[PDB]
Design a protein around this ligand. Structure first.
Ligand code: HEM
Ligand code: HEM
Ligand SMILES: Nc1ccc2ccc(CNCCCc3cccc(F)c3)cc2n1
Ligand SMILES: Nc1ccc2ccc(CNCCCc3cccc(F)c3)cc2n1
Ligand SMILES: Nc1ccc2ccc(CNCCCc3cccc(F)c3)cc2n1
Ligand SMILES: Nc1ccc2ccc(CNCCCc3cccc(F)c3)cc2n1
Ligand SMILES: C[C@H](O)[C@H](O)[C@H]1CNc2nc(N)[nH]c(=O)c2N1
Ligand SMILES: C[C@H](O)[C@H](O)[C@H]1CNc2nc(N)[nH]c(=O)c2N1
Ligand SMILES: [Cl-]
Ligand SMILES: [Cl-]
Lengths: 362, 362
C-alpha cells in the first residue's frame, strides 16, 4: 500500500507542479523515471525545482494562513545534504540569520532530509527555533506555559534556564541512530528581541514585556508529492495580534491584560467597562509600534486581511480554487472589521501542505 | 410523505417533551390521540403545555444563540386564536408592551396559528417588529441599508417615511386570503429608544446615534413536533456588540467608525494605529453605558459568554447533549477573551428549533 500511496501522490504533484512551471511536456518522462525509482529504491528524490515549488505550493495551500499572498517569494534552502548534528545546528543558526536579515524578515524554509521508511533522519523538538521557556512548580509560574513540557524535557537533558519570564530555549533535535536529542544554546548575537513600549503611554515600559522578532515554526511536516519532510523549519513575519492578543494576553499564556489595564490607567473591575477589550487594543497598538520602531517586520491584522483579499483575487485570476479555514483566518481582535469575517471558505485539504505531527517529548 | 414526516416528528417531540415534563406515562395515550387526529384531519393541535415547552426547547436548541442559559424562563403567549388583522396587530402591539416591560425586558414569544397545508394563516413581513427604514437612491443613502427592500415594499403600499436615518417601519403582515399585506404605523408610546452617549467623552452625543430598546425577531419559523409556526415573533434583550460592533459599525450598515474616531479624537489614517479597533471599543462602551443609563436591559459579551458557560454546565448536569455554532457564538470584538473561542461545538440541528424562511417581498 505504502508504495501505491507514494506513486499516486507523486503523479498528482508532478502533473500540477510542471503545469505551473510551464513544463507540461516533461511530465511523462519524469513520471517514468520516478516510477522506476520507486520500484527499485522504495522512494524518489525531488529535483531542486520540484522541492522549491512544492514548498511554495504547500504554503499557498495552508488554509489557516492569512499571509499567503506572498507564497511565491518563499526562499527555499535545500539542506537534504546534511548528515551530522553539527551540520543541522549550523543550518538552523544560518536559517535564523538569513531569515532575520537585520530585521527586514525574509520568508524562508530550510528543508532537511525526508523520512525514509517513515524513519526520520532529523527530528526537531523545538516548536519554534526561537521561543521562551516555561516553568510551573510549587504554585510558582514563570515564563511561557505553552513551553512547559519542552522546557522540562530540556532540563532532563542537562540544560538549565535562568528562570526569567523570557529564557531562550536551546535548539534541541535528535539524529537517526541516536537515542537522545542533543541541545545547543542559541547565540544571543543571532536573536533579535523587541522591547514592548507604547506610542504615548510612557508607563507601558514598566511592564517589562518583550518578544522575539522572528517566529520560525520547526515542528510541522512538509508533505510534497508523497515525500514527508518532517524536518523543514519555516518562517514569515508576525501578525501583531499573534503577540498582542494571544501570546501576551491569553490567560493560559502570559496573561497580561490586568497589568496592561493598570498601566494604561483604567479600572479592571466591571465587564461592562470593556476594560479587557480596551487593554487588548492598547497592547496590540504597543506591539505594532515597538516592532516598527526596532525595524523588525510585522503586519497589522487590517493590512494582513487586505493582502489576503488580494490573494483571493490572485487565485481567481489564476483559475485556482481557493481553500481556507474561516475559524483561523479571522483575527482575534475586531474580526468583523475584516472582509474575511463576512465570507465563507472551503476548508478542504489540498497537498502539498504543512501538517502537525506528534511531539517526541510528552 | 407529508403525513409520515409529521407523525415521525410528533413521536419524537412528544416523547422528549413529556419526558422533560415528568409526564412519561401519558405519552402512549397522547400519541394515540395525535395519530388519529393526523389520520382524520391531516394535522394535530398542541396542548398549551406542549406549545410552551416546545418554544422553550426551540430556544435551547438554537446553536447560534449565546443567550440560552435563560431558555426555561421564556414567556410564551399563545395566540392561535387570532383570526383577524386587528387581532394580529393588537397582539403585536401587546407583545411590544409586555416584552419591553418599562425597560426590564422580558424574553417573550407570541405564537400565531401555524401553517396548515403549508398554507400560512398569518405572514409577517417585518424582520423585527421594531426596526429602522433604509433608502438608497440617486447616490443618496439614508437609514439602515439592511432594510432597503422591505422599506421599498412598504412604500409601494402607501407608507411614507420621514427619511431620517432612524424612521420606524410600520408593522406589515398579510392574512390568508388577502392578496396584499396591511400595514400599521407603530405608536411611539410603545417604542423605547436609547440615545447613545459615552461615559466620559462628551462630544460623543454630536454623532446623534440612537437605537431601539428591544429586538423582536418576527420572520423566523418555529418548528415544534412537525407543526410549522411561521409567525411567532420572539425577543430577548441585546448583547451590546450586536449594536456597537455590527449595526452601527458595519460598512454595509450605519458605517460609523470614521465618525466615531473623529469624535473620540484619534486619527483614522493608519491601519497600524488600530483606530478601527479603538473606535469599536469606545462605541461599544457607549452602547452599554447608554442602555444601562436609560434602564433598558442589555448584556455585554463577557458576561454573556460567562452565562453561556453556565448553560454548557447546566446541559452537562442535565445529561443533555450540547449543540452550538462556534462561528456565531464568538463575539465580534475580543472573541479570544471568551471561553467560547477556545473550545469547539457540535453544530448539529436538533428540533424543536427556529429556522429562517424566504422573504415574501424581494
Ligand atoms: C509572510 C508572513 C506571514 C504571515 C503574516 C502569516 C500569518 C499567519 C497567521 C497569523 C497564522 C495563524 C497562526 C496562529 O494563530 O497560531 C498563520 C498560520 C499558518 N501559516 Fe502563515 N504567515 C506568514 C508566512 C507563512 C509561511 C512562510 C508559511 C510556510 C511556508 C506559513 C504557513 C502557515 C501555516 C502552516 C499555518 C497554520 C499553522 C497551524 O495550523 N505562513 N500564518
Ligand atoms: C435573553 C437574551 C438573549 C440574548 C442576549 C441573546 C443573544 C443572541 C445573539 C447575540 C445572537 C446572534 C445574533 C446575530 O448576530 O445576528 C443570537 C442569536 C439567536 N438567538 Fe438569542 N439571545 C437571547 C434570547 C433569545 C430568545 C428569547 C430566542 C428565541 C426564543 C433566541 C433565539 C436566537 C436565535 C434563533 C438566534 C439565531 C438567529 C440567526 O440565525 N434568543 N442570540
Ligand atoms: N539577557 C538577554 C536575554 C536574551 C537576549 C537575546 C538577544 C540579545 C542580543 N541580541 C542581539 C541581536 C542583534 C541582531 C541584529 C540583526 C540581526 C540578528 F540576527 C541579530 C541579548 C539578550 N540578553
Ligand atoms: N506569522 C506566522 C506565520 C506562520 C505561522 C505558522 C504556525 C504558527 C503556530 N500555530 C500554532 C501551533 C499550535 C500552538 C498554539 C498555541 C501555542 C503553541 F505553543 C502552539 C504561527 C505562525 N505565525
Ligand atoms: N421623533 C421620534 C422618532 C421616534 C420616536 C420613538 C419613540 C418616541 C417616544 N417613546 C416613548 C416610549 C416610552 C415607553 C416607556 C416604557 C415602555 C414603553 F413600551 C414605552 C418618540 C419618537 N420620536
Ligand atoms: N439579542 C438577540 C436575540 C435573538 C436574536 C435572534 C436573531 C437575530 C438576528 N440574526 C440576524 C438575521 C440575519 C440578518 C443579519 C444582518 C442584518 C439583518 F437585517 C438580518 C438577533 C438576535 N439578537
Ligand atoms: C478551539 C478553537 O479552535 C481555537 O481557539 C482556535 C480558533 N481560531 C484560532 N485562530 C488562530 N489564528 N489561532 C488559534 O490559535 C485559534 N484557536
Ligand atoms: C459570512 C459569515 O458567516 C458571517 O460574517 C457570519 C459570521 N459570524 C456571525 N456571528 C454572528 N453572531 N452574527 C453574524 O451576523 C455573523 N456573520
Ligand atoms: Cl507565536
Ligand atoms: Cl439587531
Amino acid at each position: 500500500e505504502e508504495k501505491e500511496i507514494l506513486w499516486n501522490e507523486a503523479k498528482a504533484f508532478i502533473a500540477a507542479c510542471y503545469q505551473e512551471l510551464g513544463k507540461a511536456a516533461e511530465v511523462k518522462d519524469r513520471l517514468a523515471d520516478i516510477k522506476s525509482e520507486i520500484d527499485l529504491t522504495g522512494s524518489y528524490v525531488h529535483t531542486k525545482e520540484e522541492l522549491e515549488h512544492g514548498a511554495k505550493m504547500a504554503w499557498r495551500n495552508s488554509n489557516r494562513c492569512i499571509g499567503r499572498l506572498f507564497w511565491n517569494s518563499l526562499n527555499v534552502i535545500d539542506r537534504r545534504d546534511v548528515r551530522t548534528k553539527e551540520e543541522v545546528r549550523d543550518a538552523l543558526f544560518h536559517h535564523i540569520e538569513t531569515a532575520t536579515n537585520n530585521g527586514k524578515i525574509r520568508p524562508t524554509i530550510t528543508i532537511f532530509p525526508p523520512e525514509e521508511k517513515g524513519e526520520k533522519q532529523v527530528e526537531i523538538w523545538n516548536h519554534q527555533l526561537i521561543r521562551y521557556a516555561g516553568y510551573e512548580s510549587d504554585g510558582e509560574r514563570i515564563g511561557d506555559p505553552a513551553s512547559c513540557s519542552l522546557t522540562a524535557a530540556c532540563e532532563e537533558l542537562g540544560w538549565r534556564g535562568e528562570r526569567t519570564d523570557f529564557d531562550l530555549l536551546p535548539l534541541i533535535f535528535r539524529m537517526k541512530g541516536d537515542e537522545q536529542p542533543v541541545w545547543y544554546e542559541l547565540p544571543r548575537s543571532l536573536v533579535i528581541e523587541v522591547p514592548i513600549t507604547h506610542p504615548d503611554i510612557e508607563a507601558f515600559s514598566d511592564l517589562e514585556l518583550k518578544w522575539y522578532g522572528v517566529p520560525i515554526i520547526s515542528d510541522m511536516k512538509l508533505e510534497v508529492g508523497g515525500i514527508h519532510y518532517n524536518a523543514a523549519p519555516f518562517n514569515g513575519w508576525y501578525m501583531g495580534t499573534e503577540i498582542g492578543a494571544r501570546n501576551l494576553a491569553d490567560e493560559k499564556r502570559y496573561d497580561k491584560l490586568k497589568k496592561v489595564a493598570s498601566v494604561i490607567g483604567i479600572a479592571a473591575d466591571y465587564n461592562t467597562d470593556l476594560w479587557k477589550d480596551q487593554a487588548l487594543v492598547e497592547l496590540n497598538k504597543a506591539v505594532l509600534h515597538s516592532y516598527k520602531k526596532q525595524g523588525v517586520s510585522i503586519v497589522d491584522h487590517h493590512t494582513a486581511a487586505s493582502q489576503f483579499k488580494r490573494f483571493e483575487e490572485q487565485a481567481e485570476e489564476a483559475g485556482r480554487k481557493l481553500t481556507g479555514d474561516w475559524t483561523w483566518l479571522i483575527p482575534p481582535i475586531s474580526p468583523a472589521a475584516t472582509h474575511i469575517f463576512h465570507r465563507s471558505y472551503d476548508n478542504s485539504i489540498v497537498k502539498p501542505n504543512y501538517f502537525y505531527q506528534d511531539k517526541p517529548y510528552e
